[PDB]
Amino acid sequence: MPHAFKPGDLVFAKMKGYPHWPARIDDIADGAVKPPPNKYPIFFFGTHETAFLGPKDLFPYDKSKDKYGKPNKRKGFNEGLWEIQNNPHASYS
Numbered sequence: 064m065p066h067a068f069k070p071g072d073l074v075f076a077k078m079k080g081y082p083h084w085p086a087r088i089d090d091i092a093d094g095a096v097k098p099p100p101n102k103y104p105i106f107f108f109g110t111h112e113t114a115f116l117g118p119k120d121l122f123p124y125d126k127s128k129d130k131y132g133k134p135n136k137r138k139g140f141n142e143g144l145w146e147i148q149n150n151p152h153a154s155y156s
Contacts, residue, residue, distance in 0.1 A: 068103055073124035073151050075131040076105045076116055083122060083131040085147035109143025111155050
């Protein structure tokens with residue numbers, strides 16, 4: 064059975080007006096801005112932007128990749144597909 068989401072989990076993350084986007088659940092570093100309650104810090108591959116999202120917008124990557132892991136015209140998307148598949152746990156700072 065599924066657990067709750069944890070830092071390092073890989074997902075497609077959905078935001079209004081954007082395609083389901085390869086992403087990971089980030090850690091919060093000591094000293095860093097924490098997310099609102101019930102929200103997770105989401106690191107979007109390719110764009111390397113962070114947003115705060117709740118589980119309703121988080122699709123586990125294994126289950127979802129056949130549907131969502133296809134090239135997209137959007138800036139940063141295909142770079143994001145490479146990252147999630149090839150080095151999803153690297154530092155992209």
